[PDB]
mmCIF file of C-alpha atoms in Angstrom:
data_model
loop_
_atom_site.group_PDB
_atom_site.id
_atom_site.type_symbol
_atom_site.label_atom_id
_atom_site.label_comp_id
_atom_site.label_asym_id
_atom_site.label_seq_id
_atom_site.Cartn_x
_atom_site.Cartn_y
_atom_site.Cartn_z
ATOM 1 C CA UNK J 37 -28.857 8.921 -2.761
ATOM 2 C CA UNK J 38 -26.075 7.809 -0.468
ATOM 3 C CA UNK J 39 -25.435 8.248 3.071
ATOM 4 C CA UNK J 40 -22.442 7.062 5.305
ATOM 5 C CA UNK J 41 -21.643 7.883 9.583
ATOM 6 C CA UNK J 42 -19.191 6.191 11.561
ATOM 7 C CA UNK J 43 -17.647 7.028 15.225
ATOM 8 C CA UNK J 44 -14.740 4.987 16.273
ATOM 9 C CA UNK J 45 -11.622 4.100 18.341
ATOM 10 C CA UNK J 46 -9.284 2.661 16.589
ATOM 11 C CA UNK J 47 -8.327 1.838 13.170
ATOM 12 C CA UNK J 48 -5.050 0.021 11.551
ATOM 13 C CA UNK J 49 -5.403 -0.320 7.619
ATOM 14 C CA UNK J 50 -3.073 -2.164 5.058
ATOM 15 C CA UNK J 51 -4.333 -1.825 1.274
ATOM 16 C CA UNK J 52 -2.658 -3.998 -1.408
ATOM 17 C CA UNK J 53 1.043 -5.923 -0.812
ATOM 18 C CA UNK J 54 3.428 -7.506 -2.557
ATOM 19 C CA UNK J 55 6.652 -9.554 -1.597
ATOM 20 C CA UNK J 56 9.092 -11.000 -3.894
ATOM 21 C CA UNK J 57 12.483 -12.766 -3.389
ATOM 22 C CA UNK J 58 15.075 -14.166 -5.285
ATOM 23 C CA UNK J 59 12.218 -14.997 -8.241
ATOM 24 C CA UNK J 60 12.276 -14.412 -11.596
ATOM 25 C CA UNK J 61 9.574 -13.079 -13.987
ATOM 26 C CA UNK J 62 7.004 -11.991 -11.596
ATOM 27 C CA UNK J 63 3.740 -9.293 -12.124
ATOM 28 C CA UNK J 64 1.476 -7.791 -9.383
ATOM 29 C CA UNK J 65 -1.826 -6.412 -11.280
ATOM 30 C CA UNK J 66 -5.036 -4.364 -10.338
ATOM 31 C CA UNK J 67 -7.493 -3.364 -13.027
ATOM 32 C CA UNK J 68 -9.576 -0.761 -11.378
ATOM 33 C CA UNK J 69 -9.115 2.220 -9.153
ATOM 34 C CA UNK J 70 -7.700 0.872 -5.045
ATOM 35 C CA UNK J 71 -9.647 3.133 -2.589
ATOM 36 C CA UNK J 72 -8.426 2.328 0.728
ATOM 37 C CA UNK J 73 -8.913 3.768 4.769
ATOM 38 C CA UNK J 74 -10.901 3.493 8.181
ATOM 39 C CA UNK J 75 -14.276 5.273 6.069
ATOM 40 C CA UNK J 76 -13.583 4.274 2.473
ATOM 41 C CA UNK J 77 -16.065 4.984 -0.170
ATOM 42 C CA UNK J 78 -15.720 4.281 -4.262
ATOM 43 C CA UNK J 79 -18.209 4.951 -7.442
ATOM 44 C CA UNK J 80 -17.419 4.205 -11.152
ATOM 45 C CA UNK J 81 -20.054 4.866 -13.789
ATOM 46 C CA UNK J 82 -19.083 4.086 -18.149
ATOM 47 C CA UNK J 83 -21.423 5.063 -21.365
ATOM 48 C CA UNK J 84 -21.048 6.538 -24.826
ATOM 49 C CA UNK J 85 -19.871 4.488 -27.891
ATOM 50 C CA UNK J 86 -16.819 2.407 -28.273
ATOM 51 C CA UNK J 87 -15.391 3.662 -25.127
ATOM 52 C CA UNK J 88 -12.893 1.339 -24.081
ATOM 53 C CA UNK J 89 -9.806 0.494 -21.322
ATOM 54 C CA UNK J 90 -6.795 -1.853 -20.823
ATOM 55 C CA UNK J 91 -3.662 -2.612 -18.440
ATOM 56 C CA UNK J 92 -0.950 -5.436 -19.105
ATOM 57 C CA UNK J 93 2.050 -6.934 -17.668
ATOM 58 C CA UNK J 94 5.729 -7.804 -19.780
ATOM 59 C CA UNK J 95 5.262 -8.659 -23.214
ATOM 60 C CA UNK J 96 8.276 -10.538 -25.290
ATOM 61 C CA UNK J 97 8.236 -10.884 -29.123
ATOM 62 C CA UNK Y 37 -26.445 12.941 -4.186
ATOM 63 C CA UNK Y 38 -23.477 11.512 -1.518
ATOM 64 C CA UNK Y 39 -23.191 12.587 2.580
ATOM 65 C CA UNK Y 40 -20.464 11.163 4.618
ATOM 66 C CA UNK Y 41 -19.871 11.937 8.341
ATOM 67 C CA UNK Y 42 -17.227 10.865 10.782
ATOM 68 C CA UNK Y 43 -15.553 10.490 14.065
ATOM 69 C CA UNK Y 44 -12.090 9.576 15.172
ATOM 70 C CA UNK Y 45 -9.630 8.836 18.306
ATOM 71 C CA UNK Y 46 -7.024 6.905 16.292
ATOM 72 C CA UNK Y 47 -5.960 6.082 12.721
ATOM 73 C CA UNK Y 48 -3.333 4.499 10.746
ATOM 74 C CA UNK Y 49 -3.227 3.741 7.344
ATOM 75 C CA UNK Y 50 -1.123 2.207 4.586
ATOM 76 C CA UNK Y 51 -2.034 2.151 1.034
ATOM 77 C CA UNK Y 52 0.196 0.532 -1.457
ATOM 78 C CA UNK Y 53 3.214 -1.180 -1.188
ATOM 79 C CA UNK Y 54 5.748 -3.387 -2.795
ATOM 80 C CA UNK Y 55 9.249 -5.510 -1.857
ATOM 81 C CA UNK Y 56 11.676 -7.134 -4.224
ATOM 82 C CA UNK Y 57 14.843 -8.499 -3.200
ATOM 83 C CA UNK Y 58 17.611 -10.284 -5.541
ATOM 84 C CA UNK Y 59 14.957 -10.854 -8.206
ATOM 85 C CA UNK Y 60 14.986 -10.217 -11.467
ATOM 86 C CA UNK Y 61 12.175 -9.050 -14.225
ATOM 87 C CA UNK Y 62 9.499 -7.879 -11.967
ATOM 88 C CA UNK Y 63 6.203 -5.383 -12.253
ATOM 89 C CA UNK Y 64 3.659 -3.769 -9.790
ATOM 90 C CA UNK Y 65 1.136 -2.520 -12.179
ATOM 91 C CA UNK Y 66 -2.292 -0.920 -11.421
ATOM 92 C CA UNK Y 67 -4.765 0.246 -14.045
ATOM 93 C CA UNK Y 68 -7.043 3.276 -12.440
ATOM 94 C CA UNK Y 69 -6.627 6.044 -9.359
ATOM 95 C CA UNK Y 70 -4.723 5.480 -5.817
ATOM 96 C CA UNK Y 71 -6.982 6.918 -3.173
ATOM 97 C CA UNK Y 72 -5.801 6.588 0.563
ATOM 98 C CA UNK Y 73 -6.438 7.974 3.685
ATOM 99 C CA UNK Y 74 -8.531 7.972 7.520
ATOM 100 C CA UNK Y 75 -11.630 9.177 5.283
ATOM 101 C CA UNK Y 76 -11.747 8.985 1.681
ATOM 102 C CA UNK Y 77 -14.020 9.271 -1.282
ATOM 103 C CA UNK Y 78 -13.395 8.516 -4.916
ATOM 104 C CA UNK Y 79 -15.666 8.677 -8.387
ATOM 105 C CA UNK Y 80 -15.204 8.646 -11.913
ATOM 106 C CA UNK Y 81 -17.222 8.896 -14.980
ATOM 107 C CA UNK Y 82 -17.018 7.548 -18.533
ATOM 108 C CA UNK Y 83 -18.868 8.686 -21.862
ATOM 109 C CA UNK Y 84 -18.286 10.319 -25.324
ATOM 110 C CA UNK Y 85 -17.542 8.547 -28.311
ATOM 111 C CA UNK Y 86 -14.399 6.270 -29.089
ATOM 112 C CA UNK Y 87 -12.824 7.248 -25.630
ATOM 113 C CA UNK Y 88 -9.927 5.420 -24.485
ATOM 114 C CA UNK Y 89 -7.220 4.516 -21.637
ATOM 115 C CA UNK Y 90 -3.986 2.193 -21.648
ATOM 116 C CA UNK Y 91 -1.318 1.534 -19.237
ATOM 117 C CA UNK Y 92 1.571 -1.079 -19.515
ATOM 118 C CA UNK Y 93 4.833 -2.800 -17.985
ATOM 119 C CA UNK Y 94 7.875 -3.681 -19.897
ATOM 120 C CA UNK Y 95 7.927 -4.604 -23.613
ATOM 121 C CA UNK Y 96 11.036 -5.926 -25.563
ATOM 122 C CA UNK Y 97 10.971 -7.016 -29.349
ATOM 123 C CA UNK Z 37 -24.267 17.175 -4.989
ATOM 124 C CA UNK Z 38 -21.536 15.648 -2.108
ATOM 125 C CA UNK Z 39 -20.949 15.833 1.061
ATOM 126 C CA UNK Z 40 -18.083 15.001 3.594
ATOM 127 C CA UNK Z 41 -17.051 16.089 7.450
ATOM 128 C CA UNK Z 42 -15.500 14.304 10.231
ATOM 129 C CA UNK Z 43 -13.547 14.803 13.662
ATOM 130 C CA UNK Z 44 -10.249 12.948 14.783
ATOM 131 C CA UNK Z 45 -8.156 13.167 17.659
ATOM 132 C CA UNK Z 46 -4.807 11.539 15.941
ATOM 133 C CA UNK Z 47 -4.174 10.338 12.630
ATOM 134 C CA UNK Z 48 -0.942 8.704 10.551
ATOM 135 C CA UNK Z 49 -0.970 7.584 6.748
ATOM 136 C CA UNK Z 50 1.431 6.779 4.483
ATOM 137 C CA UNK Z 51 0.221 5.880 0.127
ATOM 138 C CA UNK Z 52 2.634 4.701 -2.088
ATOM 139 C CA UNK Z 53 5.801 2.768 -1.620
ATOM 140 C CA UNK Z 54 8.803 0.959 -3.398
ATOM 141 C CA UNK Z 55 11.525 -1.307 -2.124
ATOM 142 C CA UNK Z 56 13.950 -2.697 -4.540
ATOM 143 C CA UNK Z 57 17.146 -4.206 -3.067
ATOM 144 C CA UNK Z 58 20.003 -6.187 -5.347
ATOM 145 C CA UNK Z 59 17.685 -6.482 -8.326
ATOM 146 C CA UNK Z 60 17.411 -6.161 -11.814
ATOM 147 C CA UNK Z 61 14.805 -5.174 -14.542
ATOM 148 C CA UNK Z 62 12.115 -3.677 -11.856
ATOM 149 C CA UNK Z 63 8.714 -1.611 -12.330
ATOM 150 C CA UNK Z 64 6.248 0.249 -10.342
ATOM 151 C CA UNK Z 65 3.219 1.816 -12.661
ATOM 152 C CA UNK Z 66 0.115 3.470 -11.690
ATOM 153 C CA UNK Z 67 -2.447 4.338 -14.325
ATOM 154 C CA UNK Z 68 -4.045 7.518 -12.946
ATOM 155 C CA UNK Z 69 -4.353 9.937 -10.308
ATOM 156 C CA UNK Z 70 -2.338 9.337 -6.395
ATOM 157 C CA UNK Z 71 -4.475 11.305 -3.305
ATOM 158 C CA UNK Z 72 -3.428 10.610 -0.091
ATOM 159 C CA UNK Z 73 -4.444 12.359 3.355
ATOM 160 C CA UNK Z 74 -6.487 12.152 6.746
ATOM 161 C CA UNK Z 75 -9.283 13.335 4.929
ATOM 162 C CA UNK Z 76 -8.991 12.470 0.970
ATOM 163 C CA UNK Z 77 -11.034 12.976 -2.135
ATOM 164 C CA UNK Z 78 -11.056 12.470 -5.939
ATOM 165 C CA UNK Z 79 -13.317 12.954 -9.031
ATOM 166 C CA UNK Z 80 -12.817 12.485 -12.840
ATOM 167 C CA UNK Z 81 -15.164 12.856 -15.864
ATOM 168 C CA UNK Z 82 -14.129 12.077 -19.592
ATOM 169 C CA UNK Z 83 -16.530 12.679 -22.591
ATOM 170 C CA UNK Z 84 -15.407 14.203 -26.075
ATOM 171 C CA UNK Z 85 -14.708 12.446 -29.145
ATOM 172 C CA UNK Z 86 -11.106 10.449 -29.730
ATOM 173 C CA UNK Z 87 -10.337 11.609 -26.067
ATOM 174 C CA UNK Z 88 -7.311 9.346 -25.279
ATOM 175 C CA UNK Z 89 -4.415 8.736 -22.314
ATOM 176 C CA UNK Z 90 -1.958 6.121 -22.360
ATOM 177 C CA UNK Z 91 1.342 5.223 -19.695
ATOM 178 C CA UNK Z 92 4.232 2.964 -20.044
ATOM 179 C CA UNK Z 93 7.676 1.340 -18.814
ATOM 180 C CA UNK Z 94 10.691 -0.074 -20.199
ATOM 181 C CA UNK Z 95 10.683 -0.609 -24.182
ATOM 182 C CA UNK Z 96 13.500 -2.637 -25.824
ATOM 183 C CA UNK Z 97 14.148 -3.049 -29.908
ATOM 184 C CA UNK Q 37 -21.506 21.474 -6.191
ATOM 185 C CA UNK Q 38 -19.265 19.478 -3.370
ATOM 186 C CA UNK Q 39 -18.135 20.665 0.484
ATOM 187 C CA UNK Q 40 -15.890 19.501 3.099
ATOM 188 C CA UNK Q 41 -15.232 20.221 6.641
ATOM 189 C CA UNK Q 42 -12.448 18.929 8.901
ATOM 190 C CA UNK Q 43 -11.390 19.013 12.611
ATOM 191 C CA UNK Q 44 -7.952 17.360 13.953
ATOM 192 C CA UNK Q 45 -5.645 17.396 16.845
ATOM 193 C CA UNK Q 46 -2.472 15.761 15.207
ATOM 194 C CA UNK Q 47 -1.884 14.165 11.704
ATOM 195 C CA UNK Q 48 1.086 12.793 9.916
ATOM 196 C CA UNK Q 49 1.167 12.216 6.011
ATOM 197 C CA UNK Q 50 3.429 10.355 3.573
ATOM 198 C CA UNK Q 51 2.420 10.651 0.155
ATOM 199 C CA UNK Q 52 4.542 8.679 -2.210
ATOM 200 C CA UNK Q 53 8.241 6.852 -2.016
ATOM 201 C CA UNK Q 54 10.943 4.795 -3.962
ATOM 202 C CA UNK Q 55 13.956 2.930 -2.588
ATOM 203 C CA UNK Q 56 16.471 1.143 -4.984
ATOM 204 C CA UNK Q 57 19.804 -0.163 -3.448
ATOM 205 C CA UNK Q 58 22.175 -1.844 -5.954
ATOM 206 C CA UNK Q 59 19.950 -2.538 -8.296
ATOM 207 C CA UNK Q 60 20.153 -2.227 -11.962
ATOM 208 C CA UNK Q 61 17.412 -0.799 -14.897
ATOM 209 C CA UNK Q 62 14.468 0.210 -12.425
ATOM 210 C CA UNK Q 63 11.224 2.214 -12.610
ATOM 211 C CA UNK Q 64 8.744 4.171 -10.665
ATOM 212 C CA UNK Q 65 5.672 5.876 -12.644
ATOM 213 C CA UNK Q 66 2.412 7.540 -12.332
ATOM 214 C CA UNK Q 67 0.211 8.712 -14.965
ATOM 215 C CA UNK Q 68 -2.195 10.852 -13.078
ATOM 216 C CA UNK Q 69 -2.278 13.654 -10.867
ATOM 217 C CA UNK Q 70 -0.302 13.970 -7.153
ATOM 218 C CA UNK Q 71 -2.246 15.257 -4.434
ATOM 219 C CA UNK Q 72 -1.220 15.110 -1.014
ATOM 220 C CA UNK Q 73 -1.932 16.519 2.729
ATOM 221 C CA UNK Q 74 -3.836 16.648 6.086
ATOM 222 C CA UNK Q 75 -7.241 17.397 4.169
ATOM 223 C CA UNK Q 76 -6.745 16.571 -0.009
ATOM 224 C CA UNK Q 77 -9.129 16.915 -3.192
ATOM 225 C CA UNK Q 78 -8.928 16.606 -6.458
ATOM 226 C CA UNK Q 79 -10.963 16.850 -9.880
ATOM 227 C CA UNK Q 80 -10.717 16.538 -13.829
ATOM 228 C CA UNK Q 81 -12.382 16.625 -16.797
ATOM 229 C CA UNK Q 82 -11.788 16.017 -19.798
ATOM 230 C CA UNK Q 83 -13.939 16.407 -23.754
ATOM 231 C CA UNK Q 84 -13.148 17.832 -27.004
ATOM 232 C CA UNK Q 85 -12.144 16.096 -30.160
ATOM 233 C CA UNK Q 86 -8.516 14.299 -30.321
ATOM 234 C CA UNK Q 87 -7.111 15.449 -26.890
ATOM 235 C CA UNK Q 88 -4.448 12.952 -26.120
ATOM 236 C CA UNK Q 89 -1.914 12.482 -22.973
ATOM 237 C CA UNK Q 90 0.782 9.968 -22.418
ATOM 238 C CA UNK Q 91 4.003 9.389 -19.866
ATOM 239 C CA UNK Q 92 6.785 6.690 -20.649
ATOM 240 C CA UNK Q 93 10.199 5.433 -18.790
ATOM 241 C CA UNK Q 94 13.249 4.364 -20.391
ATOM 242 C CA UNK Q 95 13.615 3.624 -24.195
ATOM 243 C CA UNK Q 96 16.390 1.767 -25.841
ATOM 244 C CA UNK Q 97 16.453 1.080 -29.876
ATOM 245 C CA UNK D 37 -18.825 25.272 -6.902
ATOM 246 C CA UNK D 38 -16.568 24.198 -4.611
ATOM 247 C CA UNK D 39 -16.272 24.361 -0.391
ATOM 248 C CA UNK D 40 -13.483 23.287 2.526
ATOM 249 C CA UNK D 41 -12.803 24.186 5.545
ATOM 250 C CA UNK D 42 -10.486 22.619 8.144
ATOM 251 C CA UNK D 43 -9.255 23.535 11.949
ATOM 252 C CA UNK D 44 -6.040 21.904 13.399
ATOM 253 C CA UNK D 45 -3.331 21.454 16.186
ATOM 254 C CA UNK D 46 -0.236 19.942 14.733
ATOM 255 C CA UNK D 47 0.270 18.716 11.386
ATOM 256 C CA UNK D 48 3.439 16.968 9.640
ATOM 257 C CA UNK D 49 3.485 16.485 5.259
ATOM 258 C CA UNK D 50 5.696 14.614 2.870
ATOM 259 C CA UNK D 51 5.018 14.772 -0.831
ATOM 260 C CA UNK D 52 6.770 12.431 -3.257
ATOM 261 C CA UNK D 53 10.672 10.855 -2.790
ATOM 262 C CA UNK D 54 12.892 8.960 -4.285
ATOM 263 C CA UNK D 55 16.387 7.494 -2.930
ATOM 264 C CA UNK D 56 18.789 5.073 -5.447
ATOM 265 C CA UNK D 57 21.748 3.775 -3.901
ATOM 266 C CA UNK D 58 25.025 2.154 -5.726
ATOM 267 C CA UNK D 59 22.071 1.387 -8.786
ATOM 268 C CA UNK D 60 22.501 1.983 -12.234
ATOM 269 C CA UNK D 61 19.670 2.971 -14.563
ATOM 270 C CA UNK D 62 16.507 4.305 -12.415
ATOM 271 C CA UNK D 63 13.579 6.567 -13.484
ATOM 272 C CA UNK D 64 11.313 8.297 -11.211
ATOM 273 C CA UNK D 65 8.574 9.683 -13.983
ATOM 274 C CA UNK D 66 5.107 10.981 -12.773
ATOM 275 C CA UNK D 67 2.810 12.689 -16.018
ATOM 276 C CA UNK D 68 0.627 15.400 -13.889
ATOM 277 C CA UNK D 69 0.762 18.248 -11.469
ATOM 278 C CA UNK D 70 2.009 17.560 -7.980
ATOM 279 C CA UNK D 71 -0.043 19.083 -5.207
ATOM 280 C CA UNK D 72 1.140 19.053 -1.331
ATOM 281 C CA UNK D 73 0.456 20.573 1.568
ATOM 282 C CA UNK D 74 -1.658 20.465 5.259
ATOM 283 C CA UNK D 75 -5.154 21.537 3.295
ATOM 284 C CA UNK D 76 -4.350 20.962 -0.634
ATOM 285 C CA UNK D 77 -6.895 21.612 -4.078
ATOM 286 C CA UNK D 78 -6.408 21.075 -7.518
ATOM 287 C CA UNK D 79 -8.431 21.319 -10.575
ATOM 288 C CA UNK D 80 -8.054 20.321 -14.451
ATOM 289 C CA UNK D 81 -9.556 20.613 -17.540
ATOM 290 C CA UNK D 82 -8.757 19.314 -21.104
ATOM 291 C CA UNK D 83 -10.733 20.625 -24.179
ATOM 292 C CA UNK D 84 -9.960 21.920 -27.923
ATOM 293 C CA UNK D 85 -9.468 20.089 -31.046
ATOM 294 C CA UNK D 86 -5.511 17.541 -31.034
ATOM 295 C CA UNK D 87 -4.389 19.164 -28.029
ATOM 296 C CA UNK D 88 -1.673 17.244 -26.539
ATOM 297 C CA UNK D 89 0.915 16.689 -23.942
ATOM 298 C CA UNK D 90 3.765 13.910 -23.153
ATOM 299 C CA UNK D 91 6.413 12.875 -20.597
ATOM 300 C CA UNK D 92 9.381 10.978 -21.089
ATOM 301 C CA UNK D 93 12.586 9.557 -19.459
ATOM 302 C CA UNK D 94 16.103 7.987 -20.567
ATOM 303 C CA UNK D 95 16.016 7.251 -24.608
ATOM 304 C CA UNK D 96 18.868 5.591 -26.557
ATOM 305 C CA UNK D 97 19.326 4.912 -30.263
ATOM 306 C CA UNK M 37 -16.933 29.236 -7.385
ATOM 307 C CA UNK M 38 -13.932 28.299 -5.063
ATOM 308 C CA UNK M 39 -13.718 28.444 -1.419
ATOM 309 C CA UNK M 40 -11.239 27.586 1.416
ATOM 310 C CA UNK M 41 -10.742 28.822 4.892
ATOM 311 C CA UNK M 42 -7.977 27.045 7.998
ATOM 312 C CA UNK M 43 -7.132 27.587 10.855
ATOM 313 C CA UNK M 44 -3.989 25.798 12.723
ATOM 314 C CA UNK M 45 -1.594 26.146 15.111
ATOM 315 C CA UNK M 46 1.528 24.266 14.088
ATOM 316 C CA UNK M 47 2.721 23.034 9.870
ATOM 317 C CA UNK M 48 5.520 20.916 9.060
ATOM 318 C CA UNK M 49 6.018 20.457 5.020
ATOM 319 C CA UNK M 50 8.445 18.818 2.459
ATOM 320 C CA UNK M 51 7.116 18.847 -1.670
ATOM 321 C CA UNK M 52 9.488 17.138 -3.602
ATOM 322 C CA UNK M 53 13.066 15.082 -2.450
ATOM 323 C CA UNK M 54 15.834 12.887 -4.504
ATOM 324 C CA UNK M 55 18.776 11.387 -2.844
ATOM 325 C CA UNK M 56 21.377 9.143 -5.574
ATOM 326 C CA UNK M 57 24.519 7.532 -3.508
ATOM 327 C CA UNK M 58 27.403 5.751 -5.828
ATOM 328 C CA UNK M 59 25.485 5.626 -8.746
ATOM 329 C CA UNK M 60 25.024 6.020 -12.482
ATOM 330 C CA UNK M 61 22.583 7.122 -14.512
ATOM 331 C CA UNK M 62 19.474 8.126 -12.892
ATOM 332 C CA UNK M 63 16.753 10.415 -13.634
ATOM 333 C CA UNK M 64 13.409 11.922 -11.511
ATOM 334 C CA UNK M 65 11.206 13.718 -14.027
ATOM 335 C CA UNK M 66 7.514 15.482 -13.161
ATOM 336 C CA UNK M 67 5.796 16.723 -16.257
ATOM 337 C CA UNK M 68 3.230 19.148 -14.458
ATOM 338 C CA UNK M 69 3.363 22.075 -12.089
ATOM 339 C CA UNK M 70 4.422 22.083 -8.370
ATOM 340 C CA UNK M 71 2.574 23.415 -5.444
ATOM 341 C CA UNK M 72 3.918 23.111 -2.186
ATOM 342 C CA UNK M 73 2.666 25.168 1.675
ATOM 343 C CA UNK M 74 0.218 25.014 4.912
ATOM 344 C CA UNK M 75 -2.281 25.711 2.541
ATOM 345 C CA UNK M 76 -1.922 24.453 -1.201
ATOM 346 C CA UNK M 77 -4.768 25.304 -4.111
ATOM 347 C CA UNK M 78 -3.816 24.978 -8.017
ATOM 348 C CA UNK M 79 -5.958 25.797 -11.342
ATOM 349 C CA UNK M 80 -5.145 24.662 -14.961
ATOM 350 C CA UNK M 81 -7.017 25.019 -18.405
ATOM 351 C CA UNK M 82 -6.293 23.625 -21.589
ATOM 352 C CA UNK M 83 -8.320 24.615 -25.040
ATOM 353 C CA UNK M 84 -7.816 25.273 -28.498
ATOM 354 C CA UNK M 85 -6.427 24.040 -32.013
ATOM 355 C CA UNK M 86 -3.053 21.743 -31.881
ATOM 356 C CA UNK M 87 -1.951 23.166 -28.554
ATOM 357 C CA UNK M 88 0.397 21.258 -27.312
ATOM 358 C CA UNK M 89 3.311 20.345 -24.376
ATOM 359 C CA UNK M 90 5.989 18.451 -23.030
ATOM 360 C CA UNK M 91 8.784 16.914 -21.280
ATOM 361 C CA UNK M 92 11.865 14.560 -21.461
ATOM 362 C CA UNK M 93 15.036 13.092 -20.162
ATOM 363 C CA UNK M 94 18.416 12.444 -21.184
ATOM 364 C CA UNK M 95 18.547 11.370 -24.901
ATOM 365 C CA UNK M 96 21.462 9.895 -26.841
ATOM 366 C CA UNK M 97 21.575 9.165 -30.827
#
């Protein structure tokens, strides 16, 4: 069982960023779900048998 | 079970971003779902047998 | 079983974004589903046997 | 089973963007699902026995 | 089983973009259904036995 | 078991936008359906034995 309420004013949301200049070779990386606002909510749930996930950035041979 | 209520004058949201300038060999990467908003919800379930995700920038051989 | 209501006056959002200026070699990725709103919601559910999903960028031989 | 309810006076949505200026060998993906608006929602599921799904950019050999 | 119901003044809605300027070599790729509007649904479901789908952008040999 | 129901006064929406200036080869690809309006809802069902789908760019050889 969940429950959430909220009443507000005001709200001024900034999630994830990313800046790059003149750089070379550069990764930004998030390995889940982003969820983002002035009433955010998130749930994950994993079972079962060999179930399995991955992300990944450049790769040079 | 999940209940979620709200109230609102003023919202502003932003969810993701990203910059590059004069770079070279860059990567945003994110692994799961993008949710944004003034409210939001998000869930996800896993089960099953030998179930599986990838995701992935650049590769060179 | 879920829930959600709410009540807003004014409300402004903006989800994903990309900026690439002069560059070379650039990547945005993002593994699963984008929602985006004043009110927002998602839900996934993976079972099965072998079930699989994948995403990818650049590939060089 | 899931419900919603919403009330607003004014809302303003953006759901996803990509800017490249003189740039060279760039890109924007998503894997998932778009889903985008004043009020949003989204579901999936997913079983059975070898059910596969994939997205790629650019390929060179 | 599934519910919504909204009420609203003004409303304003941008779905997905994409600008390239003076650029060589740029992908915009997304691997689902897009979805846009001031109340937007959408549903999917993935069963059987090897069903498959795919997405793909530039490829050179 | 599906329901919706609005009510609004004024609707403003775009779906889906490219704009290329000056330069060479570029490509925006979507490999689902598109649903665009003041109201939006979409369905979709996959089943059977090897069913299958897809989607691609240019391709040189």
């Amino acid at each position: 069982v969940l429950y959430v309420g909220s009443k507000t004013k005001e709200g001024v949301v900034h999630g994830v960023a990313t800046v790059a200049e003149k750089t070379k070779e550069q990764v930004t990386n998030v390995g889940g779900a982003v969820v983002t606002g002035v009433t955010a909510v998130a749930q994950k749930t994993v079972e079962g048998a060999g179930s399995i996930a991955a992300a990944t950035g450049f790769v040079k041979k």
